[PDB]
Amino acid sequence: EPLQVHVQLEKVYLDGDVSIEHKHEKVFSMDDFWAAYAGWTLVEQKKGYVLFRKQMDDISPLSKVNGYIGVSDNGVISTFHGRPEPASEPIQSFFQIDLERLESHMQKNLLKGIPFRTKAEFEDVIEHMKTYSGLE
């Protein structure tokens, strides 16, 4: 005689991308349900519905095929889907950097847009860029 539960799963990745997934579940054991989702955070619960969020220790799948780091705004490091144009849409913005301080080649790479396809590459580039943040 089970409880029917619409489950939504929000995955938040290291690049700032978010994905949303739906499930329909039948709950016989409440405690078994909660246990399947123990690593997730509860955003909302109603009768018949739960939305959970989880920070994934990874970049998103779409970022792995489309993922760039660029500069926007006033020298703000951003992740982008597809190479940046300045009417392009940052997935997430992170910090300002001083572009005057970047070595010429590195400046060009960033201004064109730097591809990442893995978690390692993502946080390599961010760490590199983080050197150039701070007050002048």
Distance of CA 83 to the CA centre of its chain: 17
Domain boundary among the residues 21, 41, 56 is at 56
Same domain as 133, residue 66: yes
Task: Give me the resolution in angstroms, 1 decimal.
Answer: 2.0
Same domain as 133, residue 78: yes
Residue range(s) defining the domain that contains residue 98: 57-136
**Contact call for residues 8 and 22 (beta carbons, < 8 A):** yes
Two tokens, residue 92: 């997430």
Domain boundary among the residues 39, 56, 73 is at 56
Number of domains in the chain: 2
